[PDB]
Design a protein around this ligand. Structure first.
Ligand SMILES: Nc1nc2c(ncn2[C@@H]2O[C@H](COP(=O)(O)OP(=O)(O)O)[C@@H](O)[C@H]2O)c(=O)[nH]1
Ligand SMILES: [Mg+2]
Lengths: 168, 10
């Protein structure tokens, strides 16, 4: 069976953990320990293909994790996530994309730019501005809400689709 | 640094 190795990155507070859990376990966690980096697996169907997602929800901390490095060396696609009510998280996106380019030594890594928390009225990073950024990277941009599950499947599945394309 | 702010921001 085919495995897709994904890495969810982004500034703190943006919703990396909520997006992953609401994907893997279909529920919205109110609080999930800030410190916790953990990988998540699940068998899903994407475009009529039964595959296994192997997702690393990153924590960004200093202490050495052999697993983290394993996900950086072999990870195939990335979600660069920010909150639409958190301007500073959008300003942090470039730093993560540059990191990813460093790890693969490639400007062409399958990535998805995600604006989480689309359920919230207070919006400081508007669509066009996020569309400008995603267009300058060459990647899909997807609006999500881990709270109401909106866009949650598309964000991860679009990443798997960017991975298939890169694979030929 | 997820580890500390967590649900907030920074
Ligand atoms: N309004 C709203 N709150 C969210 C959403 N996703 C997560 N949260 C809340 O955001 C907070 C922090 O996100 P978390 O899951 O810990 O991910 P982290 O930023 O990677 O630490 C928690 O209170 C979540 O319940 C969302 O899509 N909308
Ligand atoms: Mg996290």
């Amino acid at each position: 069976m085919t495995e897709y190795k994904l890495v969810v990155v982004g500034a703190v507070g943006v919703g990396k953990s909520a997006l992953t859990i609401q994907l893997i376990q279909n529920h919205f966690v109110d609080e999930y320990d800030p410190t916790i980096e953990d990988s998540y697996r699940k068998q899903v169907v994407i475009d009529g293909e039964t595959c296994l997602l192997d997702i690393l929800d990153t924590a960004g901390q200093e202490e050495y994790s052999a697993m983290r490095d394993q996900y950086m060396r072999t990870g195939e696609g990335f979600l660069c996530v920010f909150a639409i009510n958190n301007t500073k998280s959008f300003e942090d996106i470039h730093h993560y994309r540059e990191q990813i380019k460093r790890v693969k030594d490639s400007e062409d890594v399958p990535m998805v730019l995600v604006g989480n928390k689309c359920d919230l009225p207070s919006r400081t990073v508007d669509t066009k501005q996020a569309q400008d950024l995603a267009r300058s990277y060459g990647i899909p941009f997807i609006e999500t809400s881990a709270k109401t599950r909106q866009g949650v499947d598309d964000a991860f599945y679009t990443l798997v689709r960017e991975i298939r394309k890169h694979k030929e | 640094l997820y580890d500390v702010a967590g649900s907030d921001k920074y």
